[PDB]
Every structure is written in C-alpha cells, then in structure tokens.
Ligand binder design. Structure first.
Ligand SMILES: Nc1nc2c(ncn2[C@@H]2O[C@H](COP(=O)(O)OP(=O)(O)OP(=O)(O)O)[C@@H](O)[C@H]2O)c(=O)[nH]1
Ligand SMILES: [Mg+2]
Lengths: 429, 69
C-alpha cells in the first residue's frame, strides 16, 4: 500500500526499463506468464494471479517497443501501456516537444491518470530517459511539465543517461541536452546523472569484459535501482521513505543534481578471492573509479550523501566505518552540512541474475550523493555549446518545426547561472 | 550453579551461531565456484564453435578452382 510509478520515455529509458523489469520479475518470483506460484510497490494484482506492472512505455520509434512486444515478456505488460508513434524524432528537440509530441503526450497523461486512480498511497515517479535522445528529451520534458503542474506533492526522481563528455552517439547532443536540462530544472527535484561511459570502464576493470554491450550496462542500472527500492520492497532495520530522498538531498531549490554509485560489483573469481567486509565495501564505494557520472569528486566538495545497505550488515561496524570515512582526509564536505551522511539498512541481499556478469554477493551499498564536481560537467558540456552556437549551426533544423530560436539563449543563459549556483553555494562563509 | 547453567547457555548458543554463519559463507563460496564453471564452459564452447565455423568458411572460399569451358 505504498507504491511507485515508473515511466520509460525514449530509447534509453525503454531499454533500461526492459532490463529492470526483467530483474524485478526475477526478484518477486513473478514469472514471465504474469503468475506467481511484496509486489505492491511495483506490480498490481488482477484478481487471480495474473499480475500487471505499474509502468508506461513511450518511444515513438516503433522498433524497440516492438522488440519488447515480441520478446520473452509479451504476456506481462498491459497491452495499452505500450504507446508508440508512427515516426521518429531524430535527435532534435522540437520534433518531440512542439509538433510531433503534441499527439501522444495526452494519451500518456490519460494512461497515467488511469493508473494513478488505482494507486492507494503512490509515493514517487521514476522516469527513465536520455537527454541526448529526441523523443526521450522533448516528450519527456512535456510530460514532466504536465506532472509537475497537475499532481504536485509527489517527488519526481528522474534518471537521465547523459552522454559522456568524450564519447558520442550523436553530434547534436549538446543542443537537445541543454534544452532538456533547462526544461526540467524547473519541474524536477532529483536528477541523477548516469553517464554511458564510466560503466564501460567499470566493466573493463572490475569484470574483465573488454567487450561489454548495452545489455550489461542496463543490468547494472537495474541493480542500482533495485538496491534503491529495496527499502519499500522488503523490510529492514532502517526503512526509509522515498520522500526521504528529496529531503536529505535538496539543499536549495535549484541545486538538486545528484550522482550515484554502487558497490560491490565483481565477477565470480574476484568474489572467491575477496573479503567484502562492511568497512572495505563502504571504503570502496567512495573511490572515484565507480562513479556512474564520469567525474572526479575530489574536484569539489560534497553536500549530501545517502547510503542504502543490504545483506548481512551489522550496524555497529556501519557506524564505525562511516565515522572513519568522515575522518578520512581525501574527501571534503562543506561548512553548511555538518550532518552529511544518511543511512538505511535492508535485509534483502542482492540477487544473482543468471548469466549476469555480477556474482553472488552477501553485502551491498548504493550511495547517492549531492556533490559539487558535477558542476564542472556543465562547464565542459557548455564548452560544446559554445563551438556549436558560435556559428549558428543546425538552428534551421530546429526552426523547421516551430520552436522559437531565442529560447536557446534563455536555456543557455540558465545554465550560465547554474555555474554561478555552484560558485555561490560551494563557497564557504 | 545457576549462573554456570546460564553461561553455558550463552556459550553454546554463540558457538552454534558462529559455526552456522561460517557454513553460510562456505556455501556462498561454493556457489561462486559453481558460477565460475559457466563462464569457464560457455567461452570454450563459443571458441570451438568459432573455430569450426571459420574453418568451414576458409574451406568454402578456397573451394573455387577454375571452370575451363
Ligand atoms: N547505458 C545505456 N544507454 C542507452 C541504451 N539505449 C539507448 N541508450 C542511449 O540513447 C541515446 C540515443 O538516442 P535516442 O534515445 O535513441 O533518441 P530518441 O529520443 O529515442 O529519438 P529517435 O532515436 O530519433 O527516435 C544514446 O545516448 C544511447 O547511449 C541502453 O540500453 N543502455
Ligand atoms: Mg528514438
């Protein structure tokens, strides 16, 4: 009787949600048939066994949602929560926020209302979408607008797969990412950056697979989100609301851009060779090598940090290890948060998904941090925008739909002030 | 005598709890040992299969002589 709603807009969202619902069906014992031989957070019961998950699936390119509709989970998802237009967006914002998107966002709103009226104590939203995309950026921004204007009190935890500053899957990412950032910053309360590259380096070092694919990255993201929802899913000594997250991790109304980390993530052999104590694991969780957002946190000072533990985890060693962390030297907090840590334990140890490169592991910790290194990301990203708008490139591709041009400036202007933000709050007093 | 009857209670319960936890850890070690065989064997199968397929490909390519009409 305390549930979540998850939305998977765009191409990144639908893939990561595919893997994540695979994991969730694996955990709660729910079979691909939708029958089961705890689920009230995600799933819902249709009277007799055959359950349906609380989610909507939006991607106007009908290809990936077709790959779902014919996949191993054809029987599970509600045949009406699979919406897709008859065209694509092509990585520009206006193609998914002004003209094309103007069609199905109302259908999404109707479906969401007809899901929520069935909910009892719905806590938070969980959208999944890239910003470099065309339909996960525009349509997602419009849906965020509609949600933030209708319901209100509910938290809105988005999980955006930002593009790394180095690698690129498209050449117009800066535009429709600046636009997404500026259009969500006024209607979100959480935005955890999940770079698509740091996970590659992770799989290269902790897992020895020099050739990883989107499947393994999505499995890892599913693991993170499952470790997160482990609070509501099953019990534990420290059950924490999801509304806890928007309380511990929102200092000021404008600076709410967290980054996450997960530990431990190892193969079978390393687990055979390793100790995996509480101190060791909460020490490794702080290393920069496993920050989902590709950053160097030493470049800045933290502001808030929340840690969800699961497995055979003794609280006394928890307190001792976090104390030693706060006395460690390389990290640095700021003056205006002497209380920096937040903890929450659960007795649901992680799952060994068959074939998943991850190995069976007794303990786990997920660390979501509101930090200051993320700021510099914008800088480098703003970098790109400079060289792109110093020549008025691709503007015609945007005006060829109906989105006014001057908006660019505004959006860009906003991010400029954004940098000012992390030079006004990051400064001691 | 009562306090000894109780201290032996504490001792037996603890020296059972610890052996049980160690047994759990050994079972997890065995589970990881088992999981290792999957990545030990699937890679061997895929290697042998690539060998066979690419050898057959080499054969099919080389099997192009001359026509001489
Ligand atoms: N880590 C990860 N990233 C993904 C995955 N699937 C897609 N992405 C990212 O999605 C982005 C590609 O842009 P799209 O989302 O396809 O664009 P769109 O909004 O769907 O609109 P159109 O593609 O034009 O139809 C890239 O950044 C991908 O890395 C995934 O499964 N895992
Ligand atoms: Mg797409």
């Amino acid at each position: 009787m305390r549930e979540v709603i998850s939305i998977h807009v765009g191409q990144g969202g639908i893939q990561v949600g595919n893997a994540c619902w695979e994991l969730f069906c694996l955990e709660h014992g729910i079979q691909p048939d939708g029958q089961m031989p705890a689920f009230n957070t995600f799933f819902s019961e249709t009277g007799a066994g055959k359950h349906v998950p609380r989610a909507v699936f939006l991607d106007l390119e009908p290809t990936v949602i077709d790959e779902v509709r014919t996949g191993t989970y054809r029987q599970l998802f509600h045949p009406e929560q699979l919406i897709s237009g008859k065209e694509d967006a092509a990585n520009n914002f206006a193609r998914g926020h002004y003209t094309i998107g103007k069609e199905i966002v109302d259908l999404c709103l109707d479906r969401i209302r007809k899901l929520a009226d069935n909910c009892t104590g719905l806590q938070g939203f969980l959208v999944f979408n890239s910003v470099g995309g065309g339909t996960g950026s525009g349509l997602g921004s419009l849906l965020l607008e509609r949600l933030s204007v209708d319901y209100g009190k509910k938290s809105k935890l988005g999980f955006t797969i930002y593009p790394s500053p180095q690698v690129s899957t498209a050449v117009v990412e800066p535009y429709n990412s600046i636009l997404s950032t500026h259009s969500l910053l006024e209607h979100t309360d959480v935005a955890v950056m999940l770079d698509n590259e740091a996970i590659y380096d992770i799989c290269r070092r902790n897992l020895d697979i020099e050739r990883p694919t989107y499947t393994n990255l999505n499995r890892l993201i599913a693991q993170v989100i499952s470790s997160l929802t482990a609070s509501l899913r099953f019990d534990g000594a420290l059950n924490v609301d999801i509304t806890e997250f928007q309380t511990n991790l929102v200092p000021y109304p404008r600076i709410h851009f967290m980054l996450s980390s997960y530990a431990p993530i190892i193969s079978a052999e390393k687990a055979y060779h390793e100790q995996l104590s509480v101190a060791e694991i909460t020490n490794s969780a702080f290393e920069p090598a496993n920050m989902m957002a590709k950053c160097d946190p030493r470049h800045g000072k933290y502001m808030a940090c929340s840690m969800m533990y699961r497995g055979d985890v003794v609280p006394k060693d928890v307190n001792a290890s976090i104390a030693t962390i706060k006395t460690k030297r390389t990290i640095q907090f700021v003056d205006w948060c002497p209380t920096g840590f937040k903890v929450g334990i659960n007795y649901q140890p992680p799952t060994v998904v068959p074939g998943g490169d991850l190995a069976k592991v007794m303990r786990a910790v997920c660390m979501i941090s509101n930090s200051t290194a993320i700021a510099e990301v914008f800088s480098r990203l703003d970098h790109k925008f400079d060289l792109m708008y110093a020549k008025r490139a691709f503007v015609h591709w945007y005006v060829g739909e109906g989105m006014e041009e001057g908006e660019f400036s505004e959006a860009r202007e906003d991010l400029a002030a954004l940098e000012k933000d992390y030079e006004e709050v990051g400064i001691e007093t | 005598t009562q306090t000894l009857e109780l201290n032996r209670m504490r001792g037996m319960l603890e020296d059972d709890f610890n052996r049980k936890k160690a047994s759990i850890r050994q079972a997890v070690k065995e589970e990881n040992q088992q999981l290792d065989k999957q990545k030990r064997d699937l890679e061997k199968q895929s290697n042998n299969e690539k060998l066979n397929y690419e050898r057959t490909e080499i054969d099919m390519v080389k099997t192009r002589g001359q026509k001489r009409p």
